[PDB]
């Protein structure tokens, strides 16, 4: 299940290729990187903290979770 470039007539593999998922799938990823600050959200501070501790903290550290032994959400 690998992507390889072969000879157009003799079909001999003469290149390996990076796996291509789909054009749409490549469209889904974010490249513009929007700029809305957390301070721009008002009143939702508790929910913001919930989402941050659920998502960002597993990204940044992974040590405070493993030191406990928890599976991050």
């Amino acid at each position: 299940g690998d992507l390889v470039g072969v000879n157009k007539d003799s079909y001999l593999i003469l290149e390996t290729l990076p796996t291509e998922y789909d054009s749409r799938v490549k469209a889904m990823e974010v490249d513009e990187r929007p700029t809305e600050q957390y301070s721009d959200i008002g009143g939702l501070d508790k929910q913001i903290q919930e989402l941050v501790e659920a998502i960002v903290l597993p990204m940044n550290h992974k040590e405070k979770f493993e030191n406990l032994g928890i599976q991050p959400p």
């Binding site: 290729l17 054009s23 490549k26």
Partner: protein, 407 residues
């Protein structure tokens, strides 16, 4: 009674004839056979081709280009390998044919080629040389109006506040961005139009499209509702991409009640697919990624029926009500409709307006037309107040149209 024995039909069709029968049926068979002989003799009719006027075309340039250029195939680009950026290599997809690894031509440049991008390619080496525009679905691109309707805001009667508030959003920021930017305000980007049928909502949409000066796309409920799943959502994706291509654009949904129906689940899944399409729309209007300079107009006869997320401000910021016209509005629309006709100068229109019950503007145009037919059926070249009163009577009594349940 015994059935018709062969002798009985024989005598039936023999004794009862005139002394002409044989001649005229034989002559009719000759009609048919001579027609067929004429048809076979003239041959079939030439169906022909294009072939614009003869003096217009050809030149040896045609054949020279035919024998000199290349019939490029079209391929989806993908995954610029960019292994060393001195020769990047690309992947191409020839639909239902193959997938290739290729390079650019001596003409095109790496900056000219992006991922996807729907490039063109030669037919035997499959080297890439042409920048082609992306595939817009034809049933989405014909949706662009391409022709302004012959209606202006002056043709809309009575709804001064409605037209003012709608022009504040769909026309003013495009015409005068300076007012908003120098005051530092963000204008609304979504206007919903609601009211009873025949009050002029589609007329206001026509006026906006005539005065828009930007890219205006009409949208109808039937267009979005495909049969196959996700296809309507796909078309709305392409429609919003098309709107993004234009430097600002106006999107009009007529009778969004066709798709915006509130989500329900317990009906064995319900319509669902229409809900999925309106969900893709509800995301496109405001989801991830800013919408852009896309101002959007919806008109519907059932404002309450649409899903609450669609009513939500930020996607539908300003909601406008077209109620049944008042007496002044009825007079104004009667004037507007009577502008085009050949009528008496002394038609006291406000009388006709106060004879009118709670009649929509469609009723006003209908009664004006009925006066037109009264005048024409009378062959008179001037419509008179008597014609207008008969038209009022006809229209009103027709709309009114045992009934012993009354009092």
């Amino acid at each position: 009674i015994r059935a018709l024995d062969e002798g009985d039909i024989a005598l039936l069709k023999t004794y009862g004839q005139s002394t002409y029968s044989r001649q005229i049926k034989q002559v009719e068979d000759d009609i048919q056979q001579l027609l067929k002989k004429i048809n076979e003799l003239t041959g079939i009719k030439e169906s022909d081709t294009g072939l614009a006027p003869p003096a217009l075309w050809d030149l040896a340039a045609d054949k020279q280009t035919l024998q000199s250029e290349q019939p490029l195939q079209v391929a989806r680009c993908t995954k610029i390998i960019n292994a060393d950026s001195e020769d990047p290599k690309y992947i191409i997809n020839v639909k239902q044919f193959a997938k290739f690894v290729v390079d650019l031509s001596d003409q095109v440049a790496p900056t000219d080629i992006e991922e996807g991008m729907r490039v063109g390619v030669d037919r035997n080496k499959y080297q890439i040389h042409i920048p082609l525009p992306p595939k817009i679905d034809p049933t989405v691109t014909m949706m662009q109006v391409e022709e302004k309707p012959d209606v202006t805001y002056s043709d809309v009667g009575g709804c001064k506040e409605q037209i003012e508030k709608l022009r504040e959003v769909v026309e003013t920021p495009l015409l005068h961005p300076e007012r908003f930017v120098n005051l530092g305000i963000e204008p609304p980007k979504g206007v919903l139009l609601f009211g009873p049928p025949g009050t002029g909502k589609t007329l206001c949409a026509r006026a906006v499209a005539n005065r828009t000066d930007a890219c205006f796309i009409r949208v109808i409920g039937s267009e979005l509702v495909q049969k196959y799943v996700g296809e309507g959502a796909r078309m709305v994706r392409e429609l919003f991409e098309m709107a993004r291509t234009k430097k600002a654009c106006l999107i009009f949904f007529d009778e969004i009640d066709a798709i915006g129906g509130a989500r329900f689940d317990d009906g064995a899944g319900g319509d669902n697919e229409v809900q999925r399409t309106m969900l893709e729309l509800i995301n496109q209007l405001d989801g991830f990624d800013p919408r852009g300079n896309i101002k959007v107009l919806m008109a519907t006869n059932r404002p309450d029926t649409l899903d609450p997320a669609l009513m939500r401000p930020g996607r539908l910021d300003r909601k406008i009500e077209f109620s049944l016209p008042d007496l002044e509005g009825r007079t104004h629309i009667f004037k507007i409709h009577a502008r085009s006709m050949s009528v008496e100068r002394d038609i006291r229109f406000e009388l006709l307006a106060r004879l009118c019950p709670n009649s929509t503007g469609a009723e006003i145009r209908s009664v004006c037309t009925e006066a037109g037919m009264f005048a024409i059926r009378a062959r008179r070249k001037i419509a008179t107040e008597k014609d207008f009163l008969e038209a009022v009577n006809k229209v009103i009594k027709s709309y009114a149209k045992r009934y012993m349940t009354y009092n």
